[PDB]
Symmetry: C3
Subunit: 308 residues, 3 copies
Amino acid sequence: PFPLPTGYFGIPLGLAALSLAWFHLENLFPAARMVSDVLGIVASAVWILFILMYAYKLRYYFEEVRAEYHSPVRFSFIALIPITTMLVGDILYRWNPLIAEVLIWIGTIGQLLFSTLRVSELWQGGVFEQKSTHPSFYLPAVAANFTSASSLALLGYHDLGYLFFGAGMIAWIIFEPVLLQHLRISSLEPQFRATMGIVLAPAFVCVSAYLSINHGEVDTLAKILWGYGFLQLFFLLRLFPWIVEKGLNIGLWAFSFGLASMANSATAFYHGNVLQGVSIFAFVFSNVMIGLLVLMTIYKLTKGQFFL
Amino acid sequence: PFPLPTGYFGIPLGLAALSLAWFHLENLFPAARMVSDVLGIVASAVWILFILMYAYKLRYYFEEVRAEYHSPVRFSFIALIPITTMLVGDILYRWNPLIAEVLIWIGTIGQLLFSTLRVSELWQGGVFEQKSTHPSFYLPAVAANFTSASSLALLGYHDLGYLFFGAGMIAWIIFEPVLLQHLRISSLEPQFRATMGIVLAPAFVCVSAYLSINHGEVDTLAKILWGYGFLQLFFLLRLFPWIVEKGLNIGLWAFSFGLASMANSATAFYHGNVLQGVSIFAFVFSNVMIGLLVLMTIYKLTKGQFFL
Amino acid sequence: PFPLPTGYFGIPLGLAALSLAWFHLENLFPAARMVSDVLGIVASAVWILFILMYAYKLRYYFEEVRAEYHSPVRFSFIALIPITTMLVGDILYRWNPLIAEVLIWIGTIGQLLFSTLRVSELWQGGVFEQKSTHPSFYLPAVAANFTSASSLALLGYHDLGYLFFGAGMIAWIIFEPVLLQHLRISSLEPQFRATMGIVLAPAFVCVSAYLSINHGEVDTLAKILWGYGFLQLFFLLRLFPWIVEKGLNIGLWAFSFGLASMANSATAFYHGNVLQGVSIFAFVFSNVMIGLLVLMTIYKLTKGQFFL
Ligand SMILES: CCCCCCCCO[C@@H]1O[C@H](CO)[C@@H](O)[C@H](O)[C@H]1O
Ligand SMILES: CCCCCCCCO[C@@H]1O[C@H](CO)[C@@H](O)[C@H](O)[C@H]1O
Ligand SMILES: CCCCCCCCO[C@@H]1O[C@H](CO)[C@@H](O)[C@H](O)[C@H]1O
Ligand SMILES: CCCCCCCCO[C@@H]1O[C@H](CO)[C@@H](O)[C@H](O)[C@H]1O
Ligand SMILES: CCCCCCCCO[C@@H]1O[C@H](CO)[C@@H](O)[C@H](O)[C@H]1O
Ligand SMILES: CCCCCCCCO[C@@H]1O[C@H](CO)[C@@H](O)[C@H](O)[C@H]1O
Ligand SMILES: CCCCCCCCO[C@@H]1O[C@H](CO)[C@@H](O)[C@H](O)[C@H]1O
Ligand SMILES: CCCCCCCCO[C@@H]1O[C@H](CO)[C@@H](O)[C@H](O)[C@H]1O
Ligand SMILES: CCCCCCCCO[C@@H]1O[C@H](CO)[C@@H](O)[C@H](O)[C@H]1O
Ligand SMILES: CCCCCCCCO[C@@H]1O[C@H](CO)[C@@H](O)[C@H](O)[C@H]1O
Ligand SMILES: CCCCCCCCO[C@@H]1O[C@H](CO)[C@@H](O)[C@H](O)[C@H]1O
Ligand SMILES: CCCCCCCCO[C@@H]1O[C@H](CO)[C@@H](O)[C@H](O)[C@H]1O
């Protein structure tokens, strides 16, 4: 027995999001559906296993859960649980809309309850410190709201989706200023640097949610978001040797949320006949990168260097 | 004789804004007009009294005014004077557009002069400190501009209204990041905690001004603003026991600006047939809360625990 | 021989931008074209001279260039080189679209490479300090992207222009919060205060780029940007005696980017029949101010107080 590290939910997250990106190519290239189904089944299977492992953690390692919950830094990773639950719901919708809808509401209510309890509590002061200003905060504060937005849109609740979308978008703009100033002043320590991959996520996760609500209309807002997203991509590419100064590691799955959302949004740009060449590049690049993450993870597993 | 504490202008502010919310229901439910008129008359009467009291302060307690003006924290409350003057103008417009227009211009010129003189002066450095980063700064920097926007729209100056609207909206987005980071790191002391109610205001005051200019069109921007507004509401509800740790007090009128603007915007959502159930909830909730503020204020008055 | 101070590129920048503002009045008042051509030729001639001077710096004073590049503050001024190169391209487009397009791509690729190499590197921490939080950072992070946006639109690449536009707009919103908080807390030293003129630039440079892409449609976003732009103008006017506490100096060319972009955007507002009176005022004001900068620069030159 061992306690599952919460960040491992980023693996089914990235795979699930990538499944959904391929799903959105099925009417352009029908073979995309099989790719989407295989990614979706793998993501769902991994999610089930990790949910079971985390249920075991809650039962037998509760003080570890309590400590991560109350941490002004580590609490954020818990949001991966409802995020992934909603993404698995989106996948399952293609086969069973009833079960999908249950998962989507559990993850939406769960993430909103979680932020309401913990993100707000930080405003009491004295626990969060300047050094707590980490990319992981995007998970409960931003990514969870975007994922509710797009999942609720899938279910037909577009106006409710816009409320979640706005909560995420404005929360993003209100957090990022202080994050980037912190990174400029304070060198993030190597053990946390893989989480720089979360910095890729906001603009791409935002535009993918936006396009899912707005019926895939590639408008001025969508193009604006893509532009900042690519700026951040270029910055993180330049930063990559520094990010991995102390070696490649499984934490690099942090990049997969933004990469998969870049792929998803590319499908909508392509469908809309906007920047189709960029779209192709983006879709291929993100798939190659996630493919590399998969190969490195299989390798770690075959060495027995995966679970703590 | 006594010097009137400037924050007491939040009382006619909240009542005036709530009058205007009811006004906007009159064609759906005609009895709303009487409710609006009674709220409006009470707000206007209280405003007249407080303006007279503040004129007395200026004449006989000028050094107290000077000290609050030059304070990098306390100066903000002075913006309540022009804000309330414009809101009373909006109320009076239903009876006398000439007098209303005079009040609206006095409050617009007054607030813009005030910010131009004081908000900019802070950028000289060395007076404002990290500890000066309080919710009250929203008053001169954000709320005053939104109130000019909607008042100018009432008078038919929609494009000028958009200039004020943009000044407020961008000023909001540019201040809030550093406010929330400050609250996370530094516990706000109990004596200032009621001012956390001002954190409710931006998104709701923003959307209410937006809808007043844009002829009540409930569009993507409006829905985005409502979503972040509700996020902040939920956070402040969770925080409420901490806010009132040292007891209930008259400072809780700080919440009334955001509550009344939530009510006002709800009327527009309802008229637009967007999220009508949410709209009803919001309108009823804000009225109940402001009603409780009124009952607690009457009680303080009947104990002689109102004026210093 | 002497090493050219990099900030002097602000002179051809301001003149070039002002040339383009006049260009956009030619169909309303045909004599505007001659004014535009004279400004454009002067700006281009000064640019050629300064590029040659900087090429000499690179050849014979390389360690000075290296030190400014690696400085977390001084690196920003280098972005003036590609910015001005693109603006000269926009001017030359009226006579030779082929040469113009070459300059526009050199400046676009150059600025994007520059930011990708240096702006991102700051996120490694430990070099940039709180005291490095200067208005000049807008140059690589914001202004360069807006200038690419509008230049690419000139060439017909509107959707690519929107990507650059979004990169600039979101980068602006994400930097300004921490800049203004820094200015409030820390008094900027006199020797840097002229750079407060760069604070005028974002909203005006943003709206001018937006209007250049969107085919001159003066919409809600444009009006919002103008409103915040004018707020900042009023604040900087109030601050001007403090800015020039230690005397008038050539650094005041910092204001010319925002002033010229206010003029440019005014032409579009005027064409769109939005706030035409404000438009006239803005256009005349910015021209008078830049005219004063020119007269003061001629005077410095005639005293031999221009080049180091
Ligand atoms: C994803 C699930 C995370 C849940 C973490 C909940 C942490 C609650 O935390 C604990 O709850 C205890 C009661 O059991 C209280 O006695 C403790 O004071 C409190 O710290
Ligand atoms: C992801 C699903 C939501 C997790 C809900 C766990 C409920 C947390 O519970 C509460 O959080 C508070 C801290 O904010 C503590 O004061 C309480 O002791 C704790 O029980
Ligand atoms: C954080 C940055 C927010 C940018 C918001 C851009 C506003 C969207 O821009 C609007 O989009 C519409 C559809 O494309 C256009 O028709 C409008 O004219 C345009 O202003
Ligand atoms: C998100 C982008 C993924 C879409 C992959 C598109 C690859 C198809 O390639 C495109 O096929 C078209 C016909 O179908 C041709 O007209 C184009 O020239 C070709 O580039
Ligand atoms: C709402 C009204 C607030 C006005 C406060 C103005 C504060 C001006 O302040 C004082 O003005 C004096 C002249 O009377 C000067 O001698 C002082 O230096 C200056 O501090
Ligand atoms: C709400 C109506 C606007 C109030 C106008 C009061 C004018 C303030 O006046 C000035 O403010 C400056 C500080 O910025 C001081 O330098 C001056 O001494 C003071 O007179
Ligand atoms: C701080 C966040 C700003 C969000 C801006 C949202 C841009 C408004 O969004 C625009 O609104 C129009 C009317 O609903 C739509 O038709 C446009 O397509 C949509 O982008
Ligand atoms: C801002 C929201 C305030 C509006 C209050 C609406 C309360 C009216 O209630 C509504 O009345 C309708 C007919 O008028 C019915 O069709 C609806 O079922 C009912 O909910
Ligand atoms: C506008 C042009 C600015 C270019 C500045 C480049 C600064 C590069 O800097 C230097 O490059 C040297 C190689 O020449 C290396 O040996 C040094 O380590 C590096 O500091
Ligand atoms: C304005 C045109 C772009 C200038 C390109 C100069 C290339 C800078 O070059 C590199 O920058 C790095 C710092 O980020 C250093 O590590 C390298 O030593 C240096 O060569
Ligand atoms: C940082 C602030 C961003 C503000 C974004 C405003 C969104 C643009 O606003 C949109 O513009 C369209 C064209 O005018 C309108 O038709 C839309 O209804 C309006 O929401
Ligand atoms: C950017 C603003 C620059 C445009 C300068 C406009 C000055 C023209 O002036 C305008 O001329 C019109 C006829 O042409 C008249 O109808 C108007 O009354 C007059 O104000």
